[PDB]
């Protein structure tokens, strides 16, 4: 009765963010501690002004911050996937297995998922200096954040990152400064010279969003410098991971079976939140994705463009993701979920 209040708070932490996942993510009005309305789509800034105080939920936010400083993206994955992990654990503890029996099941499934991933990579970044290969490939990071002028920001950030770049790596995400000249005209933004993006918004509230999108953009260039392996985005890799983990769980006997199958059904909660944020029915598209991934397409994902539940290849469409950005996402999400699964009977402390 005390491990269910933790899960019932990590759920409510994952529901105020789930609705801001895909490019079609909602856009909520976060009143600032200073009372300044900046309606923002970013779901890492939401946590800054939400200040979740329930300690069980605070650990998922700490894992989200770890993902925000280890890599630059996947902040929602870390708290929309850990939320599914715990929602399904509560759906599994009531069967009665124990906290102990589902934690190690999740750990086995996470070890499995980190060995499936390097077999899901389907692209790379052959030349990290070719400007179209740095724009068309860095698009998805901004597209997920700022749908619309996804390719203009893509190119304008590709220019900045490729310019200040040695022959060995050493990309510095703090090198690219971002000016915020309160002009008018998004297109008027450019890259001066260490670089700098002038980022001429219109009202100093529709370029702060663009400033966060630039953050998420260049953060994808940094990780792309460390690991070139790229995995299909838009639920493709998630559905494939879920399929293979379900298979592994079906082969393996014992009580870990249930936790492994729940870890797969927790991976299915990424394309479910991707579709539920677009109007299409979630079950329709999860079935249409599992049925094309069984044939062996391995690269098909959600089609955000259409109105009805639709499937589309993500390699030929160019909506990819980054390998490290999902490796660390799954790792930190599992570690966060198993942590607040251990914690029972949150006691108050003694006044020091």
């Amino acid at each position: 009765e005390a491990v269910y209040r933790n899960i019932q708070a990590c759920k409510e932490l994952a529901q105020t963010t789930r609705t801001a996942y895909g490019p079609n993510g909602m856009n909520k009005m976060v009143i600032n501690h200073l009372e300044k309305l900046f309606v923002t789509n970013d779901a890492a800034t939401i946590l800054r002004e939400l200040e979740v105080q329930h300690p069980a939920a605070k650990m998922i936010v700490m894992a989200s911050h770890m993902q925000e400083q280890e890599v630059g993206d996947g902040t929602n994955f870390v708290l929309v996937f850990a939320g599914a992990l715990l929602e399904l654990a509560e759906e599994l503890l009531r069967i009665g297995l124990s906290v102990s029996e589902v934690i190690e099941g999740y750990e086995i499934a996470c070890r499995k998922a980190h060995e499936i991933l390097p077999n899901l990579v389907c692209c790379s970044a052959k030349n990290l200096r070719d400007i179209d290969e740095v724009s068309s490939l860095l698009r998805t990071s901004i597209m997920s954040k700022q749908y619309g002028n996804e390719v203009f920001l893509a190119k304008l950030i590709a220019q900045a990152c490729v310019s200040i770049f040695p022959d060995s790596g050493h990309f510095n995400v703090d090198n690219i400064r971002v000016c915020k000249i309160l002009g008018s005209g998004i297109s008027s933004s450019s890259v001066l010279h260490i670089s700098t993006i002038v980022l001429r918004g219109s009202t100093d509230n529709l370029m702060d969003d663009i400033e966060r999108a630039v953050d998420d953009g260049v953060n994808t260039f940094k990780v792309l410098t460390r690991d070139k392996r790229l995995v299909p985005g838009g639920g493709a890799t998630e559905i494939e991971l879920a399929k293979q983990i379900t298979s592994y769980g079906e082969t393996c006997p014992g009580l870990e079976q249930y936790a492994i199958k729940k870890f797969a059904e927790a991976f299915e909660a990424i394309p479910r939140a991707l579709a539920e944020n677009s109007g299409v029915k979630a079950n329709e598209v999860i079935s249409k994705l599992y049925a094309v991934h069984q044939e062996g397409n391995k690269n098909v994902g959600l089609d955000i463009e259409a109105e009805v539940p639709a499937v589309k290849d993500m390699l030929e469409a160019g909506i990819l993701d980054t390998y490290l950005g999902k490796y660390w996402a799954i790792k930190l999400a599992t570690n966060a979920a198993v942590t607040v699964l251990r914690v029972d009977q949150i006691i108050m402390a003694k006044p020091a």
């Binding site: 105080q53 300690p55 069980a56 605070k58 650990m59 297995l97 124990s98 906290v99 102990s100 029996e101 942590t339 251990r342 914690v343 029972d344 009977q345 949150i346 006691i347 108050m348 402390a349 003694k350 006044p351 020091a352």
Partner: protein, 323 residues
């Protein structure tokens, strides 16, 4: 007519035994989940909000808001009793929580508390005897200390950290002889250091996994007839009480805490070798062979501490409002 009121009247004869026993049982049911590997951490949020995963007895009893005054006592007396032995709490609080429950039956049946405690004393003597005849004393080679440190590090951190710190603690003591998760790692390393130190000091690594609790309870029951009259009801409440450690060990690993204990008591009676609780399959296992070791400085004091505290909390007639 000034000052004619005889105030200060609380807790008469049982009203205090009931209160103290309920407080001890509550403190047991709070720490019952954190015993052994596959246990369960606790949060301990402060006023500022500094969470602290704290699966152990010392840091818990020393830092948690214990409302009941009797439980506050049992914690102030149990914390100050595990710095001469290193770490044996979370077993003290439980065993006390059964010396005080297995006695509530006979006390409610109409027995006098100072009759059980005589049985507690005789049972403690026989338990110390059986523990001095069961100590396996072997050389403190790096191999054994690996086990004596791994079994005490898996107790505080999972097998990811408790499989890289064993080497660091058995090679930081073999070179001296002649964030909310850094506090956790620091305390686990200080407790593995204390465990390997206590193993080095005496040289006895008496088996664990509840094997000695089972073998110490059954020798008592085989010794009960030869003690005395109503004293026998103190060695049959100190026998079923050094029997929760296997029970709670099985309970924390998702097993029925009556089938595993029965299998252990049967397999111990067949082969005569002291057998413990396998935390993965629930079947009995030989803790000496598998490589789980307790300390003859921790279970030698787990008897004195538990018996002293339980006898003292059984020997109370009134709880009165002092100044």
């Amino acid at each position: 007519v000034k000052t004619l009121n005889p105030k200060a009247e609380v807790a008469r004869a049982q009203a205090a035994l009931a209160v103290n026993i309920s407080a001890a049982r509550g403190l047991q049911d709070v720490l019952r989940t954190n015993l052994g590997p596959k246990g369960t951490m606790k949060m301990l949020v402060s006023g500022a909000g500094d969470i602290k995963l704290t699966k152990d007895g010392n840091v818990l009893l020393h830092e948690m808001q214990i409302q009941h005054p009797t439980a506050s006592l049992i914690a102030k007396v149990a914390t100050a009793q595990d710095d001469i032995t290193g770490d044996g709490t979370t077993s003290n609080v439980l065993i006390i929580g059964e010396l005080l429950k297995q006695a509530d039956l006979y006390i409610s049946e109409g027995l006098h508390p100072r009759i059980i405690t005589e049985g507690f004393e005789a049972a403690k003597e026989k338990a110390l005897q059986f523990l001095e005849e069961v100590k396996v004393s072997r050389e403190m080679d790096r191999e054994t200390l690996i086990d004596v440190a791994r079994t005490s590090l898996r107790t505080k951190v999972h097998a990811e950290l408790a499989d890289v710190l064993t080497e660091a603690v058995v090679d930081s003591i073999l070179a001296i002889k002649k964030k909310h998760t850094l506090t956790q790692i620091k305390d686990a390393v200080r407790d593995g250091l204390r465990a390997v130190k206590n193993a080095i000091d005496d040289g006895c690594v008496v088996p664990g996994a509840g094997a000695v609790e089972v073998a110490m309870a059954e020798a008592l029951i085989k010794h009960k007839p030869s003690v005395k009259g109503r004293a026998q009801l103190g060695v049959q409440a100190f026998a079923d009480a050094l029997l929760i450690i296997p029970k709670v060990l099985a309970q924390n690993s998702g097993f029925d805490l009556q089938e595993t204990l029965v299998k252990i008591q049967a397999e111990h009676s067949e082969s005569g070798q002291l057998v413990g609780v396998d935390l993965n399959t629930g079947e009995p296992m030989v803790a000496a062979e598998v490589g789980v070791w307790d300390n003859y400085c921790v279970k030698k004091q787990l008897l004195h501490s538990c018996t002293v505290i339980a006898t003292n909390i059984l020997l109370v007639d009134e709880i009165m409002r002092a100044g």
